[PDB]
Design an enzyme around this catalytic site. Structure first.
Site, mmCIF file in Angstrom:
data_model
loop_
_atom_site.group_PDB
_atom_site.id
_atom_site.type_symbol
_atom_site.label_atom_id
_atom_site.label_comp_id
_atom_site.label_asym_id
_atom_site.label_seq_id
_atom_site.Cartn_x
_atom_site.Cartn_y
_atom_site.Cartn_z
ATOM 1 N N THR A 118 0.828 -1.208 0.000
ATOM 2 C CA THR A 118 0.000 0.000 0.000
ATOM 3 C C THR A 118 0.863 1.259 0.000
ATOM 4 O OG1 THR A 118 -0.221 0.288 2.387
ATOM 5 C CG2 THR A 118 -1.616 -1.371 1.332
ATOM 6 N N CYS A 148 -0.856 7.477 -3.451
ATOM 7 C CA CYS A 148 -2.193 8.010 -3.692
ATOM 8 C C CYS A 148 -2.168 9.165 -4.686
ATOM 9 C CB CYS A 148 -2.824 8.448 -2.371
ATOM 10 S SG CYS A 148 -1.639 9.092 -1.169
ATOM 11 N N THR A 149 -1.109 9.976 -4.668
ATOM 12 C CA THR A 149 -0.989 11.050 -5.647
ATOM 13 C C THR A 149 -0.729 10.491 -7.041
ATOM 14 O OG1 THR A 149 -0.164 12.530 -3.923
ATOM 15 C CG2 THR A 149 0.223 13.174 -6.209
ATOM 16 N N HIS A 175 -1.586 19.012 -0.589
ATOM 17 C CA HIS A 175 -1.862 17.796 0.158
ATOM 18 C C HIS A 175 -2.369 18.110 1.561
ATOM 19 C CE1 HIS A 175 -1.457 13.647 1.544
ATOM 20 N NE2 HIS A 175 -1.215 13.305 0.291
ATOM 21 N N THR A 178 -1.017 14.362 7.134
ATOM 22 C CA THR A 178 -0.887 12.924 7.333
ATOM 23 C C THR A 178 -0.339 12.647 8.731
ATOM 24 O OG1 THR A 178 1.333 12.866 6.364
ATOM 25 C CG2 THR A 178 -0.536 12.573 4.874
ATOM 26 N N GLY A 208 7.852 12.308 -5.283
ATOM 27 C CA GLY A 208 8.241 11.704 -6.541
ATOM 28 C C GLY A 208 7.079 11.012 -7.220
ATOM 29 N N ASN A 312 -6.865 10.934 -0.360
ATOM 30 C CA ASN A 312 -5.625 10.220 -0.083
ATOM 31 C C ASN A 312 -5.828 8.993 0.798
ATOM 32 O OD1 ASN A 312 -5.836 13.100 1.261
ATOM 33 N ND2 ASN A 312 -5.095 11.719 2.870
HETATM 34 AG AG LIG Z 1 -1.255 11.466 -0.901
#
Ligand SMILES: [Ag+]
Length: 329
Positions: A118, A148-149, A175, A178, A208, A312
């Protein structure tokens, strides 16, 4: 498809909640450094997605979610998990600690058939994003769902490239916060900015995820890179794709191309909206990329700025199960 989850974090808990809404994937075992009473609490109550839809109890040191027993363990070593006893086919690797083929193969040794990371792989483990390169899967035993991006930028960039052709692209994801960041200016050896107060700052961050699009889409390799800004929101982010087009195209032609793919070959993956949507309008969105038509802007017919929303947590989790279901075919 019996699936075991390693790492009951944010992604681990949302993968569990999304599996309760599917009929082809059944969670049977969870491993984390937490007791069963605590795991039932982190599932029953969620600050971002509300209370769990269903029942959850603790009996014999194991969870009983919706009348189904789920084996709970706290093995720090992935090889001591014994997936043979519960009968797991695919292991959802959601710890972030074992992102290599050497460390993730311990689940195969522990009795599992396949492993899905994941997170973006740190080695040559192939990454697969739905709508981008799920057809390029060649039966590997350990795969990756990228980030997720990446699951948001790749489906949009593929449609734009196949229609108009992307010469060069530069993206930016606003974003959300997190579990890496801190509530208050604390230590963070890997990222100095990330240690600053999350609820107080707009924190720049390197990513990245745009350069990783070249791995799931070899035709865009070296043509995409980007950055990020961490903003004090608990969930739902948005990318800011700035691409230079090869073929001349107006914005109304770009909207029609994204809308054709949203209602066509990329339904359920690439979304489309013409409403005055904000971030909380996508809390819990299954789509990994929702194109905001009114938010985008174009300078000419070959230089446009595209806006795409994505969750996300929920969007990426639902595509982890979609990768588990695809490798099991
Ligand atoms: Ag993300």
């Amino acid at each position: 498809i019996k699936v075991g989850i390693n790492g009951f974090g944010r992604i681990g808990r949302i993968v569990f909640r999304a599996a309760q809404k599917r009929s082809d994937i059944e969670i049977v075992a969870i491993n984390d450094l937490l007791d069963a009473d605590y795991m039932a609490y982190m599932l029953k109550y969620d600050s971002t997605h509300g209370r769990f839809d269903g029942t959850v109890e603790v009996k014999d040191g194991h969870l009983i979610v919706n009348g189904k027993k789920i084996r709970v363990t706290a093995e720090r070593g992935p090889a001591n998990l014994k997936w043979d006893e519960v009968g797991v086919d695919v292991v959802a690797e959601a710890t972030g600690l074992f992102l290599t083929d050497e460390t993730a193969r311990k689940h195969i040794t522990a009795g599992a058939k396949k492993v899905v990371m994941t997170g973006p792989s740190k080695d040559n483990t192939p990454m697969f994003v739905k709508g981008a390169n799920f057809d390029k899967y060649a039966g590997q035993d350990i795969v990756s769902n990228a980030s997720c991006t990446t699951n948001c930028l790749a489906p949009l960039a593929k449609v734009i490239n196949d229609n108009f052709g992307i010469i060069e692209g530069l993206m930016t994801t606003v974003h959300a916060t997190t579990a890496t960041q801190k509530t208050v200016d604390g230590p963070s050896h890997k990222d100095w900015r990330g240690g600053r107060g999350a609820s107080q700052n707009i924190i720049p961050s390197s990513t990245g995820a745009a350069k990783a699009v070249g791995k799931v889409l070899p035709e865009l390799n070296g043509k995409l890179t980007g950055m990020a800004f961490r903003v004090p929101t608990p969930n739902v982010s948005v990318v800011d794709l700035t691409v230079r087009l090869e073929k001349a195209a107006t914005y109304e032609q770009i909207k029609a191309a994204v809308k054709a793919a949203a209602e066509g070959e990329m339904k359920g993956v690439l979304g489309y909206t013409e409403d005055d949507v904000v971030s909380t309008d996508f809390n819990g969105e299954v789509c990994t990329s929702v194109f905001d038509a009114k938010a985008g802007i174009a300078l000419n017919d070959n230089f446009v700025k595209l806006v795409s929303w994505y969750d996300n947590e929920t969007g990426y989790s639902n595509k982890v199960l979609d990768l588990i279901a695809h490798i099991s075919k």
